[PDB]
Amino acid sequence: SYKPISFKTVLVSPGLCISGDVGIAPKQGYFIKHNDHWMFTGSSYYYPEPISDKNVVFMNTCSVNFTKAPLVYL
Amino acid sequence: TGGSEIRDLLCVQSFNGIKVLPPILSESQISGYTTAATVAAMFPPWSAAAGIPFSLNVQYRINGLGVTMDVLNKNQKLIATAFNNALLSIQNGFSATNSALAKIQSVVNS
């Protein structure tokens, strides 16, 4: 069995609206803040990776309580 | 030990050597375990709900059946209202002659 031995506390987000009412959500992980731009992180190992479409489930519209950031493009 | 009633069966059984010992864990502890599991499922960190907010978990579970995501987050208020209504109905349904109570009184009476 896989087993962690150390931990780190970070601020996460389950999704965000990035364009004209579109939604993105992580496949298995979270979105984290790093200097005014968001990156994906796996849910069992802390490693910032750039925003891709292979780790993101697209949405036709985002939820009302998702974070708002028109700056992120995809 | 101290009483004025004689038609009870449990006292006669206990005096005749037949006795039902309490379990090693009290039901208060098991209720605390179920409460802890439910709270960890609901509040962050979402341990029992695969690390995601509960409403979004309901949204994704409904979407996986075939429901599109456009109508899901535009019906979130009525989805939560329907979930609360289902919880209240399943709460109030135990007052009638339900089937779960049929099993519980079945094992007790057996």
Cα separation, B34 vs B39, in Å, equals 9
* DSSP letters for B78-104: HHHHHHHHHHHHHHHGGGSS-HHHHHH
Task: Tell me which chain A residues have a C-beta less than 8 angstroms from the C-beta of B54.
Answer: none
Amino acid identity for residue A16 in this structure: L
Structure method: cryo-EM
Give the dihedral sign, CA A59/A65/A66/A67.
Answer: positive
Task: Find the residue in B nearest to A42 (Cα).
Answer: B51
DSSP line for A21-54: T-EEEESSEEEEESSSSEEEEESSS---B---SS
Identify whether the C-beta of residue A39 lies closer than 8 Å to the C-beta of residue A8: no
Distance CA B70, CA B80 (A): 16
* B73:A62 CB<8 A: yes
* Distance between A35 CA and the closest CA of chain B, angstroms: 24
Query: At how many Å resolution was this determined?
Result: 3.4
Residues in A closer than 8 angstroms to B52, CB to CB, are 14
* B71 touches A at CB < 8 Å: no
Whether B78 contacts chain A with CB within 8 A:
no
Which residues in chain A are closer than 8 Å to B68, comparing Cβ atoms? 60
